[PDB]
Design a protein around this ligand. Sequence first.
Ligand SMILES: [Br-]
Length: 96
Amino acid sequence: QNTVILGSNLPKSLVKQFQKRINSNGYLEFEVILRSTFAKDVIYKVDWLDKDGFVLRDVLNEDYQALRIPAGQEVILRKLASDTRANDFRLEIKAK
Ligand SMILES: [Br-]
């Protein structure tokens, strides 16, 4: 919502659903399910958020990542925080 931010060249219905949980080591993991009628190459970026909703700026961040979404196949994007202070996330997705 304000959790997954899609660029103007992606369909609004790209994101099927998302969810998160804290795993049994104490780290937040999220799963975003994507699907598209046509094959699309996209580029995504993750921000981890703390208990107040502030960006955690002192954790190792991953660079922009490419992702291939095959035509009509469900794609499950799964990410795991590296810091226990992460309690939420923000995901940007744009067309390659
Ligand atoms: Br875009």
